[PDB]
Each structure stands twice: as C-alpha cells, then as structure tokens.
Amino acid sequence: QDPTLAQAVRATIAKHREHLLEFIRLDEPAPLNAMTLAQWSSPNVLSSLLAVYSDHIYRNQPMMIRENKPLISLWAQWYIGLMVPPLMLALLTQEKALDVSPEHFHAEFHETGRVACFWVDVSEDKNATPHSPQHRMETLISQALVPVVQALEATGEINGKLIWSNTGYLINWYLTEMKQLLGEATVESLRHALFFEKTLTNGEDNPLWRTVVLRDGLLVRRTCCQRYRLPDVQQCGDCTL
Numbered sequence: 001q002d003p004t005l006a007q008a009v010r011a012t013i014a015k016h017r018e019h020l021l022e023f024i025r026l027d028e029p030a031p032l033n034a035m036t037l038a039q040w041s042s043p044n045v046l047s048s049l050l051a052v053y054s055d056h057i058y059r060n061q062p063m064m065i066r067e068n069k070p071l072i073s074l075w076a077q078w079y080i081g082l083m084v085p086p087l088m089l090a091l092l093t094q095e096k097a098l099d100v101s102p103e104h105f106h107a108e109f110h111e112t113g114r115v116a117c118f119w120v121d122v123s124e125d126k127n128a129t130p131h132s133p134q135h136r137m138e139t140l141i142s143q144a145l146v147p148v149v150q151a152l153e154a155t156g157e158i159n160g161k162l163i164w165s166n167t168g169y170l171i172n173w174y175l176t177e178m179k180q181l182l183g184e185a186t187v188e189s190l191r192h193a194l195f196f197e198k199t200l201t202n203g204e205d206n207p208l209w210r211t212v213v214l215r216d217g218l219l220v221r222r223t224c225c226q227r228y229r230l231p232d233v234q235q236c237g238d239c240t241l
C-alpha cells in the first residue's frame with residue numbers, strides 16, 4: 001500500500017529535519033482551542049491573543065509604554081517562523097504538493113498568546129504539484145502568507161513591509177540551511193526569483209523583493225525585526241544595527 005500525502009510529508013521531515021515535527025501535526029485531530037486564520041484573525045479574537053502576548057512580554061514592566069509594532073512583529077515571527085520551515089521542506093522535496101490554503105491549518109496558541117503548534121488536514125494541491133520550486137514558493141506566498149500579513153495589517157498597528165521583511169530573512173535563512181539538501185541550482189534560482197525580482201511570475205508584486213540584499217557577496221537582511229525594542233527580548237545576532 002502507498003503512503004498518504006500526510007505520511008509522505010511526515011516521513012520526509014523525520015528523514016531530513018526531524019526537529020520540525022515538534023510544531024506541526026499531519027492528519028491528526030486539532031484540539032478544541034485551535035483556530036484557523038479565519039477564526040483567529042477576527043478582530044475581537046486577534047485583539048485578545050495580542051493582549052495576552054503583550055502582558056507576557058511586558059509582564060515585568062507594567063508602567064512602560066508599550067510599542068504594538070515590535071510586539072506584533074514578534075508575534076508574527078512566531079507564527080510564520082513555525083509554519084514556513086516545514087512547508088518549504090515539504091514543497092521543495094516532495095513530488096506531490098501539499099495544500100497550503102490557510103483553512104487547512106489549525107493553529108494551537110501557546111498560553112502566552114503566540115502560536116505553539118500547527119495541526120494540518122493534509123490534502124494534495126493538484127494544481128501546484130506540476131509546479132516548479134519557484135511557483136510552489138509563489139503559491140506559499142500567495143495563498144498561505146499574504147492572508148496572514150493582511151490579517152495583522154488590519155489591526156492598524158503595523159505595516160506589512162516589516163512582516164514581509166522578517167519573512168524574507170526567514171526564508172533565506174532556511175534555503176542556506178537547506179542548501180546541501182536542495183542543491184546549488186534550486187537555491188540560486190529561488191534566491192534570485194524571490195529576492196531580486198520586483199514581480200511574481202503572474203505579474204503582481206513580489207512582497208519579498210529586497211527583503212534581503214547583497215553586502216560583501218552574502219545575503220543579509222535589509223530591515224530589522226525591531227524585537228530589541230521590547231523589554232527582556234534580545235537583539236538578533238544578525239541585526240541590521
């Protein structure tokens with residue numbers, strides 16, 4: 001008997017990046033409290049999640065004026081930082097394409113208000129299985145990540161560009177970390193397409209354009225995630241500063 005897409009993806013990650021399985025569940029039932037983008041993006045629900053995360057980050061600074069912009073940036077770094085790595089691995093090293101529509105992703109949120117684990121109902125994206133690596137990453141961008149940035153941009157407390165900036169850095173970080181796995185051809189192709197092309201293959205704007213730039217012949221982030229502005233949160237080791 002042949003594996004399901006869920007068992008296939010799960011095997012591929014156990015093979016190459018076993019640690020990523022801590023934050024993703026494939027074709028397992030989601031807990032009651034878990035929510036899809038549609039659910040947690042509701043202004044009342046999302047404002048409650050961010051309130052909890054605010055109290056946590058400022059738990060030792062109840063007098064300090066709070067900066068919602070670096071706060072949401074960090075909340076989103078959690079969300080996108082936990083969701084994307086296993087999806088880059090699945091989409092870039094699987095014959096069949098996993099469907100990444102946000103409605104298949106039930107997010108279980110940590111007690112601190114940030115996301116903790118993603119519970120996925122796995123189905124094939126038969127439209128995107130014939131797609132190359134570039135068009136599979138464009139699909140991740142268009143279907144999985146744009147809705148998320150738009151949900152947070154709707155709070156009126158952060159501009160999308162900062163989130164895209166941190167996402168571009170993240171994606172580039174894992175391409176380099178996965179470079180022996182993916183090969184020089186696919187790495188160079190994706191870097192150019194994702195970071196040095198103003199437009200997507202479908203004409204629309206590429207929101208990852210110039211989120212990483214060339215300085216001394218190596219790819220570094222162009223924009224700071226601003227997490228240093230939060231109390232008891234450390235400046236990133238590869239900050240623009």
Ligand code: FES
Nearest residue numbers: 224225228236239
């Ligand atoms: S890049 Fe994170 S603090 Fe600057």
